[PDB]
Design a protein around this ligand. Structure first.
Ligand SMILES: O=C(c1cccc(F)c1)[C@H]1CNC[C@@H]1c1ccc2c(=O)[nH]cnc2c1
Lengths: 20, 347
């Protein structure tokens, strides 16, 4: 499932801003 | 429906006109040096960033709790965020809206910049969303409505916010949203070019280095509503480059439990074509406010905080931080030498 794929990904924690 | 110009629109116009008057006064003469570090007792870290942290503090003379953001001037300079930090403070001291966290004091010393804001004890939307999985559409609509009104307010002052995400939205004691983190907010007429934001939330024109305006906030609103209602963002991957490839592709897929009204709103917000993106058309924000998905929303009642919230955060007395994660603490050191004085002179 999409949800399972999300949960197993490296981006379910707080996401840092970018700016370069 | 979203084009009509009855009396209701003139009330909004009158409201926004007075708001701009107040804003401009403060914008043109910013408050500066309105407290000192020793007036606050530092208690616990509430969150962190690349060049600073936010701590729970208690104001000694009143016993009020606040959230004090502490930014290391040298680190700001190294990351080339001087002007953005000046933007943040100048804008935040000038604005006033029910869903905007207030800047109560600001000051600086040899080492650091300080922004003392209201403490919002309910924690980040991010924490609650991840834990519960996803919000119901009525729950998401409630929060979404507040962002819509907030962007209407901000955009009328020629401000762009540029970092909408659950990490940047706090829940207050009444269950309403408080927007914080004005680090990328900017006052600009016409167009700007800075590459900034968070990868999941970036509009295609930002990724493609096109030059852009307030329409990127409305795209970000699309991403936010999707993530609230789905439990995951519309474009995710392990690496940012793959996220960007999905974003510019023009393809979005919706969970089967998304209502048809929700999918329709989201297709108009997650619109790669600026000539077609909701919030960016002739009817402005009113294409959004009059969309079918918001039919049940009483915008005035939202503004007045008369609507019943989906949930009220657990509150264990004042100073309780149980709705926030724990972070590693670090002693504040103030150098005996002034750092970066010229760069931050107007702060
Ligand atoms: O800790 C934070 C932080 C730390 C350093 C830099 C920065 F830009 C932000 C922010 C990031 N998202 C929320 C976090 C936060 C956590 C709590 C409050 C608060 O109680 N009042 C005002 N802003 C707050 C902001």
């Amino acid at each position: 499932t999409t949800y399972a794929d999300f949960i197993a990904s490296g981006r379910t924690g707080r996401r840092n801003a970018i700016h370069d | 429906a979203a084009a009509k110009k009855g009396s209701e629109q003139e009330s909004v116009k009158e409201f926004l006109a007075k708001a701009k008057e107040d804003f401009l006064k403060k914008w043109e003469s910013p408050a500066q040096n309105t407290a000192h570090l020793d007036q606050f007792e530092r208690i616990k870290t509430l969150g962190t960033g690349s060049f600073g942290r936010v701590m729970l503090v208690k104001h000694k003379e009143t016993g009020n709790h606040y959230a004090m953001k502490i930014l290391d001037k040298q680190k700001v300079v190294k990351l080339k965020q001087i002007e953005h930090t000046l933007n943040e403070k100048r804008i935040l001291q000038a604005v006033n809206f029910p869903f905007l966290v207030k800047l109560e004091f600001s000051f600086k010393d040899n080492s650091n910049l300080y922004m003392v804001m209201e403490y919002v004890p309910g924690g980040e939307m991010f924490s609650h969303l991840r834990r519960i999985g996803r919000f119901s559409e009525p729950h998401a609509r409630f929060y979404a409505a507040q962002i819509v009104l907030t962007f209407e307010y901000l955009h009328s002052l020629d401000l762009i916010y540029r970092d909408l995400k659950p990490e940047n939205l706090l829940i207050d004691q009444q269950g309403y949203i408080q927007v914080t983190d004005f680090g990328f907010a900017k006052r600009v007429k016409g167009r700007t070019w800075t590459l900034c934001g968070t990868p999941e939330y970036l509009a295609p024109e930002i990724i493609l280095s096109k030059g852009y305006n307030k329409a990127v906030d409305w795209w970000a609103l699309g991403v936010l509503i999707y993530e609230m209602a789905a439990g995951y963002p519309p474009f995710f991957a392990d690496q940012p480059i793959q996220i960007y490839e999905k974003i510019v592709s023009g393809k979005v897929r919706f969970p089967s439990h998304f209502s048809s009204d929700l999918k329709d709103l989201l297709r108009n917000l997650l619109q790669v074509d600026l000539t077609k993106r909701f919030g960016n058309l002739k009817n402005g924000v009113n294409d959004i406010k009059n969309h079918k998905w918001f039919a049940t929303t009483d915008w005035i009642a939202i503004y007045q905080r008369k609507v019943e919230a989906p949930f009220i955060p657990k509150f264990k007395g004042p100073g309780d931080t149980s709705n926030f994660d724990d972070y590693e603490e670090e002693e504040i050191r103030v150098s005996i030498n002034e750092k970066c004085g010229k760069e931050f002179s107007e702060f």
